[PDB]
Amino acid sequence: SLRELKVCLLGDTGVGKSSIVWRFVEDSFDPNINPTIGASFMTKTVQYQNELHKFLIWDTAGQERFRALAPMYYRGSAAAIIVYDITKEETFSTLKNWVRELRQHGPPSIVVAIAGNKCDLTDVREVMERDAKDYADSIHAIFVETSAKNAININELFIEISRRIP
Template sequence: MPTVKLVVIGASGVGKTSLRTQYISGRFSTGYRATIGADFISKTLPHPTKPDQSVTLQIWDTAGQERFSSLSAAFFRGADAALLMFDVNKPETLTALTRWWSQFREKAPLSDDELEDYCCVVVGNKIDFQNQKLYNSSTN
């Protein structure tokens, strides 16, 4: 069974673990507990083009604290895709994605000629009904 390794990258507290938990189990927790190093979970999915086969999706949730950055090379290596996440309520987490992406490219490693075909998605997180009301009132 083929495996797809997806790494979720971004600053501490942007919601990487919450997104992963919500996708895998449909649960959400309001409690915050920082990821130490990295954690991964797998989910078996139907193969997109071969109905009789499955694919294992490994979602690697990486720590956002700077003190764990030395461990990231091991977690980034062999990644098939990257999800760069920021908190829409903290603009500095969006600007920090430039640094996160550079670190990922260096430690994955990902060469310039691989970039055109590489799957990387940027996700703004933490917009919910309450935050949306605050955002709308501050922009009017």
């Protein structure tokens, strides 16, 4: 048996959406990765208990000219991963806007996950873990501080999704 799970990544440009997906699927990291144009699609199948979860992963362009396309991506998604950058408070401040948009226009029972990415960059941290954790908890979302660079909580993010899908 095999279970298809559409997952979309949402967030401001530069937060590491593509790097998260590349690390999960291709097990690689590129400091020189270019901004996404349109969307990138990758897939990985993982054993969860007695089933196989085939993640159909939509890596969306964060650049504002692509925002209008977002509804196309979250439609039919089993989960949404909203990514911010722990070194830029602006991307966290903005988190509520992404959540709002997913509340207002997304599927009724989507699994929401919040990823605080670039957690390897601790010296220049701007978003305290506790504050982002508190927020994720308040909306009953999955939360992890991730690093695509160091492979911190990348698999764990998708494991939490596997646990919480119906």
